[PDB]
């Protein structure tokens with residue numbers, strides 16, 4: 001990635017910024033800019049490219065063959081019980097929260113068993129993340 | 136990715152910004168800009184490209200063959216019981232929340248068993264994320 | 271992706287911004303701009319491209335063959351019981367919520383068993399996300 | 406994607422913005438702009454492209470062959486019971502909500518078993534998302 | 541990655557910044573800038589590239605063969621019970637939260653069993669992260 005940028009407030013090439021009651025008197029501004037950008041990116045010179053796979057099975061006996069890909073949960077037990085019993089009481093609850101499984105950003109590109117890959121793969125994530133603001 | 140940008144407030148090439156009761160007197164501004172951009176991106180020179188796969192099975196005995204792809208949950212138990220019993224009480228609940236499974240952004244491009252890939256794959260995610268604001 | 275941009279408030283090439291009771295006196299502004307952009311993107315020079323697959327089965331015995339693709343849930347139990355019993359009480363509930371399964375953005379491009387792919391694949395997601403605002 | 410943009414409020418090339426009771430005196434503005442854009446995108450030079458697949462079965466015995474594609478739920482149980490019993494009480498409920506399965510944006514392009522693909526595939530999603538606003 | 545940047549507040553080439561009630565008297569500013577950037581990135585000169593794999597099984601007996609990919613949870617038990625019993629008491633709860641499993645940013649590119657890869661792979665993540673702000 002030639003250019004990746006996270007800029008909180010302001011991005012600018014040339015900035016003349018006059019803010020909060022300043023006095024802007026005699027100013028002469030002369031700006032002369034020559035800017036040229038040449039992008040030669042990902043050019044590929046390829047005569048011959050071959051992806052080839054072959055499988056042959058002969059005179060074989062196969063019994064109880066198990067192939068299981070990734071990300072298996074099988075048996076998971078989530079027990080979160082809450083019991084509140086009050087005879088004569090004063091109970092004030094402000095900003096109370098219970099969260100079990102929260103997923104914001106899930107990116108999965110290639111999950112497989114057998115993968116043959118020629119090329120380019122790029123993952124870019126930018127965020128501002130604030131979970132809980134109260135009071 | 137040649138250019139990826141997250142800019143919170145303002146993005147500008149040339150900015151003359153006059154804000155919050157300033158006094159803007161005699162100003163002369165002369166701006167002379169020559170800007171040229173040449174993008175040569177992803178050009179491919181390819182004579183011959185071949186994707187080939189072959190499978191042959193002969194005189195074979197196959198019994199109990201199991202192939203299972205990824206992301207299997209099988210058996211999951213979610214138990215969240217809530218019991219509230221009050222005889223003579225005062226109960227004030229402000230901003231109370233229960234969430235079990237929350238998914239904002241799920242991107243899956245290639246999930247398979249057998250994959251042959253020639254090319255380019257790109258995933259880009261930008262967000263501002265605020266979950267809970269109260270009070 | 272040549273240009274990807276998230277800009278919170280304002281995007282502008284040249285900005286003359288006069289805001290909140292400023293005094294804008296004698297100004298002369300002369301702006302001379304030459305801007306040229308040449309986009310050569312994804313041009314492909316390809317003589318011969320072949321995608322070929324062949325499968326042959328001969329004199330074979332196959333019994334109990336199971337192929338199962340991804341994303342299987344099988345057995346999932348969601349139990350969220352809520353019981354409220356009040357004899358003589360005062361109960362005030364403001365901004366109370368229960369959510370089990372919430373999915374905002376689900377993008378799936380290629381989920382398969384056998385995939386042969388020549389080309390270009392791109393996923394781009396931009397959002398502003400605020401879940402709960404109350405009070 | 407050459408240009409992807411999320412701009413919260415304002416997008417403009419050249420902006421003269423006079424807002425909130427400013428005094429706009431003698432101004433002379435001369436703007437001279439030459440802008441040219443040339444888009445050569447996705448041009449393909451292809452002599453011969455062949456997609457070919459062949460399957461032959463001979464003298465074979467196949468019994469109990471099961472192929473199941475992705476996204477199977479099978480057995481899912483959703484139990485959310487709510488019981489409210491009040492003898493002599495005061496119950497005030499403002500902004501109370503229960504949601505089990507909510508799906509905003511579901512995009513699925515290619516979900517299959519066997520896929521052969523030559524070309525270009527692009528998914529772009531932009532949104533502003535606010536779930537619950539009350540009070 | 542030629543350029544990766546995290547800039548908290550302001551990024552600018554040339555900045556004339558006048559802020560918080562300053563007095564801006566006689567100034568003459570002459571700026572003459574010649575800027576040229578040439579990007580030759582990821583150009584590949586390749587005559588012949590071959591990815592080839594072959595598997596053959598003959599006169600073999602295979603029984604109880606198990607291949608299991610990564611990320612298996614099997615048996616996990618989450619027990620978080622909460623019991624509150626009050627006879628005559630005063631209970632004030634402000635900014636109280638319980639979270640079991642929270643996942644913000646999950647990026648997985650290639651998780652497989654057998655992978656052959658020719659190319660370039662890049663993962664870039666930028667964020668500002670504030671979890672809990674209250675009071």
Ligand SMILES: *[C@@H]1O[C@H](CO)[C@@H](O)[C@H](O)[C@H]1NC(C)=O
Pocket residue numbers: 025026161
């Ligand atoms: C500078 O500004 C003052 C105002 O205080 C003015 O009297 C004077 O003529 C100005 N000079 C020039 C060169 O603009």
Ligand SMILES: *[C@@H]1O[C@H](CO)[C@@H](O)[C@H](O)[C@H]1NC(C)=O
Pocket residue numbers: 032033034572574
């Ligand atoms: C502006 O810059 C260019 C460079 O391309 C130069 O030829 C020209 O003389 C400059 N003009 C002034 C007034 O400085």
Ligand SMILES: *[C@@H]1O[C@H](CO)[C@@H](O)[C@H](O)[C@H]1NC(C)=O
Pocket residue numbers: 046047180181182
């Ligand atoms: C690569 O491109 C050039 C022209 O840009 C061409 O002359 C040459 O024949 C190409 N390569 C092959 C292997 O054809």
Ligand SMILES: *[C@@H]1O[C@H](CO)[C@@H](O)[C@H](O)[C@H]1NC(C)=O
Pocket residue numbers: 063064199603
């Ligand atoms: C295959 O496995 C099962 C249990 O998973 C077992 O009962 C069976 O006997 C096995 N096959 C052979 C041929 O032993």
Ligand SMILES: *[C@@H]1O[C@H](CO)[C@@H](O)[C@H](O)[C@H]1NC(C)=O
Pocket residue numbers: 160161296
């Ligand atoms: C500068 O502004 C002042 C106002 O205070 C004016 O009297 C003067 O003529 C101006 N000078 C020029 C060169 O514009």
Ligand SMILES: *[C@@H]1O[C@H](CO)[C@@H](O)[C@H](O)[C@H]1NC(C)=O
Pocket residue numbers: 032034167168169
């Ligand atoms: C503006 O810039 C160009 C560069 O292309 C130059 O030829 C020209 O002389 C400049 N004009 C002035 C007034 O500086």
Ligand SMILES: *[C@@H]1O[C@H](CO)[C@@H](O)[C@H](O)[C@H]1NC(C)=O
Pocket residue numbers: 181182315316317
């Ligand atoms: C590539 O393109 C050039 C012209 O741009 C052409 O002369 C050449 O024959 C092409 N390559 C092949 C292998 O045909």
Ligand SMILES: *[C@@H]1O[C@H](CO)[C@@H](O)[C@H](O)[C@H]1NC(C)=O
Pocket residue numbers: 063198199334
């Ligand atoms: C295949 O597996 C089942 C249980 O999954 C088992 O009952 C059966 O005997 C197995 N096949 C053979 C030939 O053993």
Ligand SMILES: *[C@@H]1O[C@H](CO)[C@@H](O)[C@H](O)[C@H]1NC(C)=O
Pocket residue numbers: 295296431
């Ligand atoms: C500048 O503005 C003042 C107003 O205060 C005016 O008297 C003067 O003639 C102006 N000068 C020019 C050069 O416009």
Ligand SMILES: *[C@@H]1O[C@H](CO)[C@@H](O)[C@H](O)[C@H]1NC(C)=O
Pocket residue numbers: 167169302303304
């Ligand atoms: C404006 O810019 C062009 C560049 O194409 C230049 O030829 C011309 O002389 C400039 N004019 C002025 C008044 O600066």
Ligand SMILES: *[C@@H]1O[C@H](CO)[C@@H](O)[C@H](O)[C@H]1NC(C)=O
Pocket residue numbers: 316317450451452
């Ligand atoms: C590619 O395009 C050029 C013209 O742009 C043409 O002369 C050439 O024959 C093309 N390539 C093939 C293999 O035909």
Ligand SMILES: *[C@@H]1O[C@H](CO)[C@@H](O)[C@H](O)[C@H]1NC(C)=O
Pocket residue numbers: 198333334469
């Ligand atoms: C195939 O599997 C079933 C159970 O899934 C089992 O009852 C049967 O015996 C198996 N086939 C053979 C030939 O063993």
Ligand SMILES: *[C@@H]1O[C@H](CO)[C@@H](O)[C@H](O)[C@H]1NC(C)=O
Pocket residue numbers: 430431
């Ligand atoms: C500038 O505006 C003032 C008003 O205060 C006026 O008297 C003066 O003639 C104007 N000058 C020009 C050059 O427009």
Ligand SMILES: *[C@@H]1O[C@H](CO)[C@@H](O)[C@H](O)[C@H]1NC(C)=O
Pocket residue numbers: 302304437438439
């Ligand atoms: C405007 O720009 C063009 C560039 O195409 C230039 O030829 C012309 O002289 C310019 N005119 C002025 C008044 O600057």
Ligand SMILES: *[C@@H]1O[C@H](CO)[C@@H](O)[C@H](O)[C@H]1NC(C)=O
Pocket residue numbers: 333468469
């Ligand atoms: C096929 O599977 C069923 C159960 O799914 C089983 O009853 C049957 O015996 C199997 N076929 C053979 C030939 O064993």
Ligand SMILES: *[C@@H]1O[C@H](CO)[C@@H](O)[C@H](O)[C@H]1NC(C)=O
Pocket residue numbers: 026565566
């Ligand atoms: C500088 O500013 C003063 C204002 O205090 C003014 O009297 C003077 O003429 C200015 N000089 C120049 C060269 O602009």
